[PDB]
């Protein structure tokens, strides 16, 4: 597999789940070899038990599922690191991690992603970011996390917060207003 195992920048992107650009000897950043696929994930961020000596393919590329059928059940963005769900669909690993009540059937392999126990309070929210970034039709879809500032009611999709730099590592996120004043 093509991997990065250090933080070194060659004298000659980052993880889809955790956004870290560095790799480790015991936790490499592995790059999907699927055609036109740009997934890169840490072994531990994606549940790769054995990094192959040959090519490595993410689960979506392995499935060769129709590109029309590859969609996260929990957010409106495709691309990124996906696993199959218990309901016969797909979901981002990052969405699974940052929506509190989502689980994995196996935490070593991090799959399938289990949605059966999400309560309806993740599902009746509106993503304020989608409402801001020209995605008004998708803002009320999928599942939102809530700002981790106690009492805040701002809600947002995990991936939308991820793209906005509003997640942090317990897996939580803050609306932009409240994130600005948090000591990083
Ligand atoms: Zn990672
Ligand atoms: Zn792939
Ligand atoms: Zn998602
Ligand atoms: Zn959104
Ligand atoms: Zn907030």
Residue numbers in the entry: 1 to 12, 23 to 179, 189 to 203
Paper text:
Human AF10 (or mixed-lineage leukemia translocated to 10 (MLLT10)) is essential in hematopoiesis and implicated in blood cancers. Here, we show that the PZP domain of AF10 (AF10PZP), which is consistently impaired or deleted in leukemogenic AF10 translocations, plays a critical role in blocking malignant transformation.
To define the molecular basis for the interaction of AF10PZP with the histone H3 tail, we generated a fusion construct that contains residues 1–12 of H3 covalently linked to the residues 19-208 of AF10 via a short GSGSS linker. We note that the position of the H3 sequence in the linked construct, which is N-terminal to the sequence of AF10PZP, was critical because a free Ala1 of H3 is required for the interaction with AF10PHD1. The structure revealed a saddle-like globular fold of AF10PZP comprised of five zinc-binding clusters. The Ala1-Thr6 residues of the H3 tail occupied an extended groove of AF10PHD1 with Arg2-Lys4 forming an anti-parallel β strand that paired with the protein’s β1-β2 sheet, whereas Ala7-Gly12 residues of H3 curved away from the protein surface. Characteristic β-sheet interactions were observed between the backbone amides of Arg2 and Lys4 of H3 and Y41 and L39 of AF10PZP. The guanidino group of Arg2 donated hydrogen bonds to the side-chain carboxyl group of D43 and the backbone carbonyl of C42. The side chain amino moiety of Lys4 was restrained through a hydrogen bond with the backbone carbonyl of E31. The side-chain amide of Gln5 formed a hydrogen bond with the backbone carbonyl of A35, whereas the backbone carbonyl of Thr6 was hydrogen-bonded to the backbone amide of G33.
